């Protein structure tokens, strides 16, 4: 058995999530079946926690806000839910979901946990279907529970589904596909609430606004557009990226949005006025992962070469100076 592991590199990371009871770990969805998790550096973090449960590369990743539950989407057509084991201080495989014809592209976990565990698992795959998988209640046997039946299965898009986002109240979820359209489905039933089709290229990412009824969608047309759920129309169209925008996330509640693109430039944008407040340039390759903490007070972006940039909001500090 191995005392400790040192990771020279982490390849290309599709998505990243803050994990752990203290949210001091960083789970990585690299181009490898193993689930790599690293502690947040002090602000060199060579140590990495490698969990091997999948047979193929991890397409996407989702985690609960509490950080004790992780859902991994893989290219082997299966999704795995991992639970944190406080006794061993490591995550263990909780359940496996196999009923997918093709690779699972995106995975969604509840934004709210009331029973102490996530109760459903939203998944999207290249088979062009969305499946809501119920999660078992905790069992002391600690043997992995394999589920092959989903609550509902709905055909979603004609092209590959790129991203999946869950609303704060877990009432609706939005799926981003390369088909130039985003569709919002009722979480309880999977019924199509509305279809958002204004971008000219495939939508790489879709993000629910965590506080009020807004959506941010990123396309290959170098644009981001803010949508209002109540009207299901575009409030603001965001322009200025030289290359395709791959990630889009809200920070500072409603006030601002952050976007990462294939141009490697992270741009801080103003939702209300649509004027670019700041540009952060710390990478030399495309950015596939962008995670935020504390309403964007902490931002981490992973480069395709394997470089992480750990950004910290300090407007108050600069103002103090």
């Amino acid at each position: 058995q191995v005392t400790s592991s040192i990771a020279g590199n982490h390849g290309i990371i599709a998505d990243m999530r803050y994990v752990g009871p203290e949210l001091n770990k960083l789970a990585l969805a690299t181009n490898s079946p193993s689930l790599r998790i690293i502690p947040v550096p002090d602000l060199l973090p060579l140590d990495v926690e490698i969990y091997e449960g999948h047979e193929d590369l991890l397409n996407s990743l989702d985690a609960t806000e509490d950080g004790l539950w992780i859902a991994t989407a893989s290219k082997d057509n299966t999704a795995i839910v991992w639970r944190y084991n406080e006794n061993s201080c490591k995550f263990d495989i909780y359940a496996k979901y196999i009923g997918h014809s093709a690779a699972v592209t995106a995975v969604g976990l509840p934004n709210i946990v009331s029973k102490g565990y996530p109760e459903f698992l939203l998944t999207a795959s290249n088979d062009l279907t969305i499946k809501k998988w119920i999660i078992p209640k905790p069992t002391a046997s600690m043997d992995v529970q394999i589920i092959k039946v989903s609550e509902y299965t709905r055909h979603a898009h004609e092209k590959d589904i790129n991203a999946l986002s869950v609303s704060p109240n877990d009432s609706i979820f939005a799926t981003a596909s390369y088909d130039k359209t985003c569709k919002i489905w009722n979480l309880e039933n999977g019924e199509l609430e509305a279809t958002l089709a204004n971008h000219k290229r495939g939508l790489w990412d879709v993000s629910f606004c965590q506080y009020d009824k807004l959506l941010a969608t990123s396309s290959g047309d170098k644009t981001v557009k803010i949508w209002s759920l109540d009207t299901f129309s575009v409030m603001k169209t965001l322009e200025g990226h030289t290359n395709a925008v791959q990630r889009c996330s809200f920070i500072n509640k409603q006030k601002q949005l952050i976007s990462c693109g294939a141009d490697g430039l992270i741009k801080i944008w103003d939702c209300s006025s649509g004027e670019c407040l700041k540009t952060l340039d710390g990478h030399n390759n495309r950015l596939w992962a962008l995670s935020t903490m504390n309403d964007g007070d902490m931002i981490v972006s992973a480069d395709a070469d394997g470089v992480f940039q750990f950004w910290k909001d300090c407007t108050e500090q600069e103002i103090e100076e």
């Binding site: 709210i112 704060p168 109240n169 506080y211 509640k253």
Partner: protein
């Protein structure tokens, strides 16, 4: 013309939407929502 009007009149009996119809162009081809804002308050 009166023949034209009658034929047009009969068409509306068989009238449908065109969203699902394949275009002839292809012939050439062959808690509350704001609950988190409340966790902030409390």
């Amino acid at each position: 013309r009166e023949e034209r009007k009658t034929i047009i009149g009969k068409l509306q009996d068989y009238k449908i939407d065109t969203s699902l119809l394949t275009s002839s162009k292809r012939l050439g081809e062959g808690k509350k929502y704001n609950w988190r804002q409340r966790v902030e308050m409390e």
